[PDB]
């Protein structure tokens, strides 16, 4: 994500305490801070080489992934840098020795290192409270094919 207007806000978007010295020209252009989130979650090369800021990103931001590592189907990418995932499960009623389908809607912050859409299976990880309802970041996206390569028209 090296484009689409990083400085789109009234404040200068920068990573805090990362200093680009203008007197000595750095050998690498526009020094970027990144980290591995841990738990075998690979920092994407878009996070490493991008130009976005996202202070709530799990790789280039100031949040840490710790706690639950959940997985869910994306049902809504209609916010800016926040998605809603569906965590469908099954609840056991012990009287009838049977289960019932249930679901929970979890709002998750998404970094612009990840391009997600409705239908993707994402792996999310618990962070500190990001907003009123968001306590998770997307740390992994698990839809590469998605059966979306053969639907297009032919001759």
């Amino acid at each position: 994500s090296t484009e689409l207007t990083v400085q789109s806000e009234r404040a200068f978007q920068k990573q805090p305490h990362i200093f680009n010295n203008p007197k000595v020209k750095t050998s690498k252009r526009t020094k970027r801070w990144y980290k591995n989130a841990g738990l075998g979650f690979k920092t994407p090369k878009t996070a490493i080489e991008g130009s976005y800021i996202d202070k709530k990103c799990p790789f280039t931001g100031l949040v840490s992934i710790r706690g639950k590592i959940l997985t869910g189907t994306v049902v809504s990418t209609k916010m800016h840098r926040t998605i809603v995932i569906r965590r469908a499960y099954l609840h056991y009623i012990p009287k009838y020795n049977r289960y019932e389908k249930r679901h929970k809607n979890v709002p998750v912050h998404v970094s612009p290192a990840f391009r997600v859409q409705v239908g993707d299976i994402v792996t999310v990880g618990q962070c500190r409270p990001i907003s009123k309802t968001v306590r998770f970041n997307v740390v992994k996206v698990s839809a590469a094919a998605g059966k979306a390569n053969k639907q297009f028209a032919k001759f």
Binding site: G38, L39, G40, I69
Partner: protein
């Protein structure tokens, strides 16, 4: 609500204190100290209930204010001072030293040690960290900050504290094949050697421990306390050696010991 709690209800006490259900509504709430409230044994419970040296709590106070008891070489005149695991209790009158180690049923045992063993204790390293002015310190399981440790000392190691000058005499690493004293859970009080440590990056590293009778059991690493090598422990083990006989073998021992 509204502040710190100062009363411990009887039936809210730790079960290993073995307080009777009747005879009072309250239990001795331990003071703040080196050990956690549910993993410690107050001096009133040790003196009045275990040793039976006092009949009341008034007599426990009368014992302690003559500076008779001392825990880890210091006097500790509090009635509910939290004497926890590894703690050496010296009674200078009666000329005896106790080490607060668990029995295999999960309870603090009356374990008399010698005056040589009363000159030291063992401590599980809780953190190794750099303090102010760049000085490394190590924190044991009983709240002791010990400055300038050995650089080979890591977390989950066991140091040997000298109790007069509280320094590290030596230490034991956390490797496979070293003795464990299990200090928490339903396997509490058991003694065995590490088969291997199962990692689980993210939380709750597990330890597979095998005792002298080849019975393996899995325990979280919060409850594992290294006490020595394969065999030859650095402390003196209590009577029973952390074996956990089953209840059939326990009644077999009782019928083989009471019939003469």
């Amino acid at each position: 609500a509204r502040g710190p709690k100062k009363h411990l209800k009887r039936l809210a006490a730790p079960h290993h204190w073995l307080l009777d259900k009747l005879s009072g509504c309250y239990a001795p709430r331990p003071s703040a100290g080196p050990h956690k409230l549910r993993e410690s044994l107050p001096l009133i419970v040790f003196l009045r209930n275990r040793l039976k040296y006092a009949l009341n709590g008034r007599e426990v106070k009368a014992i302690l204010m003559q500076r008779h008891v001392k825990v880890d070489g210091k006097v500790r005149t509090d009635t509910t001072y939290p004497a926890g695991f590894m703690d050496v209790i010296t009674l200078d009158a009666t000329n005896e030293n106790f080490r607060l180690v668990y029995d295999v049923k999960g309870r603090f045992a009356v374990h008399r040690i010698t005056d040589e063993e009363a000159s030291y204790k063992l401590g599980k390293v809780k953190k190794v960290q750099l303090g102010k002015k760049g000085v490394p310190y190590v924190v044991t399981h009983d709240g002791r900050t010990i400055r300038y440790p050995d650089p080979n000392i890591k977390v989950n190691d066991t140091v040997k504290i000298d109790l007069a000058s509280g320094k590290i005499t030596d230490f034991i690493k956390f490797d496979a094949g070293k003795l464990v004293y299990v200090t928490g859970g339903r396997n509490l009080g058991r003694i065995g050697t590490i088969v291997h440590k199962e990692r689980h990056d993210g939380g709750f590293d597990l330890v597979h421990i095998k005792d002298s009778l080849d019975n393996t059991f899995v325990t979280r690493l919060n409850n594992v306390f290294v006490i020595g090598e394969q065999g030859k422990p650095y402390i003196s083990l209590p009577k029973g050696k952390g074996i956990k006989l089953s209840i059939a073998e326990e009644r077999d021992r009782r019928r083989a010991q009471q019939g003469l």
